[PDB]
Amino acid sequence: MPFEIVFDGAKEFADLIATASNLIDEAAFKITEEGVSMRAMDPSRVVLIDLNLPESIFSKYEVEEPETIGINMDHFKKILKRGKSKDTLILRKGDENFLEITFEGTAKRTFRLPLIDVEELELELPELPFTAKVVLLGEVLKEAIKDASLVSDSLKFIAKEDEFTMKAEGETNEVEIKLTLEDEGLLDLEVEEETRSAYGISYLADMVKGIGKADEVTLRFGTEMPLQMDYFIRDEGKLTFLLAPRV
Amino acid sequence: MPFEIVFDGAKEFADLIATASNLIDEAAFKITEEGVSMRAMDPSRVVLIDLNLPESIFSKYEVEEPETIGINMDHFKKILKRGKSKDTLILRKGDENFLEITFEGTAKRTFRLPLIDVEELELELPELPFTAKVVLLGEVLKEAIKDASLVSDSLKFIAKEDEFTMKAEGETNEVEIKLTLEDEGLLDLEVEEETRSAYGISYLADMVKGIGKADEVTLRFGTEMPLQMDYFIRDEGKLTFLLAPRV
Amino acid sequence: HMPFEIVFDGAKEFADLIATASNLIDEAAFKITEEGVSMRAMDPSRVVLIDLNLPESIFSKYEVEEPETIGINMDHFKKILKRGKSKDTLILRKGDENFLEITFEGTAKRTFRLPLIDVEELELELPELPFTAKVVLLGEVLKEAIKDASLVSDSLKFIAKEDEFTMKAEGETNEVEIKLTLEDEGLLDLEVEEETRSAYGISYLADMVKGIGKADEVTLRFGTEMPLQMDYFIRDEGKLTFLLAPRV
């Protein structure tokens, strides 16, 4: 009654939530007339995650009573993983303290996930003076991070006007992944000035694990600045990570 | 005591035996002129299995004189798993005490499986006074059992005149799988009174583990009564489970 | 150790070939000449000899200034090569430095630096042995037969007669026989001077065939109580050969 939210393609929704539970244990979901929003940090406070799902991506969106619900992400994910690619997903909140999760397909399957109280910090998604913007295929990003992990625990990002390089170096071994606009993997490159920063590979691997090979990923960063990594859900939804630099 | 039994498609035969070995360790196979039959209980005596493979599903069927052979089901399954989807399977017994198992395909591969003797019991499949019958797609049944296992160790079956519900509840968590004749998953429903029973998920999971997503499964049960579960092999073969209810 | 540049179209195919050899050896010396690349090594137990020959004809670019031998950690080479994609171009390059540059050119340019190691080389000959039986069979049949036999025994008997090839394993109570004739799809050729019988350790056989393709044409040559020679061809021109001691 307080809200009813319907998404066509339950497995696609599960995959989106799964990306976020890779860094997050618990999260507050704010459900308004405009859409669903979520913002949280990983337990080490190194990564900020911001999820925005406008009502335009839902087949039915009815919010009688706007509110904020607390969800254990591991439990949520476990239930959503039961959804099939052709299932319709329904999120329903009654008067009681649980979220009703229904998969409608060859049958009607209804789970009750008890809501929890999550201590919500005031988290701001700041505007940052990024000097480099990179749009690249998820496949390239995911492979670069895997390549770098054979070598080191950190990955250097280097943007110049004509080339984007991700470089990792160990005691003896080294890997360099280089993209120019001549390469199929680089879809856009915008570089206000030469930009160099480094990031922990363990965090990057968790950020990209759920991203699809065909997905388009936007990176923004600055010298010794955080990395902002965005990808879009059904064109209008957006998943954003902000990753503290490595020093 | 010679016989020769030939089945087109070794992997399909492997799959069928694999379903049965999920609960059975050893089995007497009765080999007669009309077909092959097998009947056994799991080690806890909670589930009875009945397998009937009429002569009509075999491409060649030559039985000198009816006889019963005892087979270690795990060993049998291990050999049968070596068969390929396009292999012809030949089951042959000479006068010696082993089963000759041949896969004929890109090569001729012959295994020798020693026969054992099996404690054969007062095992019959009585006709119980079932009050509900449900025919449903395997994938609905398999998914409901996986869903319920997230929540509890027992699954309640509830049949009314136009709805079949499988429900499980934990301390706070609950799931309900509902089917009506409007649903693609429900192929038939016949309910002569409101019927309610519960069954152990661990046994149900082992029973359906081998069933195929598009197999048509028939369920019969009564209130506080065993569950009968069967599905057909090549239309004429039949695999039947009878499962004790849970208190 | 002069510079060279060697280019192979299809990085994943190259990785798979290297992976097959890495199943048995840990370190290998690669001889790079103007004619091609060759590698010969033994497994740590000295039961299996491996011989890899990759002529220049299978490489899309092949620039070698002077012949040289480089030592390579096969596990670290395989782990890098496993990052190549099926449509990547693979570039193996050496400069003046003592490392190998491994580049995948595809949707991006990915360059790894592999330290070269010192590999003390044994006096390894690929002897011309008087094999009395030759079998050409599909990799699918050979791989299945080794798996089948492993259900039963630790050794696999090879029996070649004029008209049939049999692989046979026996356990305490259990037994498997895999039989092929020229009427069979799995058998492409059979040439037998005299009836030939030998047996080989399945653990080695499994390691030898693990990387072989189900459609590859594998040639077997053996003799009674003699080693087994197993080879298959790469781009019809390169060749990977195993020589496996028999079980006695």
Swiss-Prot record, chain C:
It holds the Pfam family PCNA_N. Coiled coil: none annotated. Keywords: DNA replication, DNA-binding. It comes from the Archaea. Gene3D superfamilies: 3.70.10.10. Disulfide bonds: none annotated. CDD domains: PCNA (cd00577). GO terms for biological process: leading strand elongation; regulation of DNA replication. InterPro entries: DNA_clamp_sf, Pr_cel_nuc_antig, Pr_cel_nuc_antig_C, Pr_cel_nuc_antig_CS, Pr_cel_nuc_antig_N. GO terms for molecular function: DNA binding; DNA polymerase processivity factor activity. Sliding clamp subunit that acts as a moving platform for DNA processing. Responsible for tethering the catalytic subunit of DNA polymerase and other proteins to DNA during high-speed replication. Homotrimer. The subunits circularize to form a toroid; DNA passes through its center. Replication factor C (RFC) is required to load the toroid on the DNA. NCBIfam families: pcna, PRK01115.1-2, PRK01115.1-4. Belongs to the PCNA family. This is DNA polymerase sliding clamp.
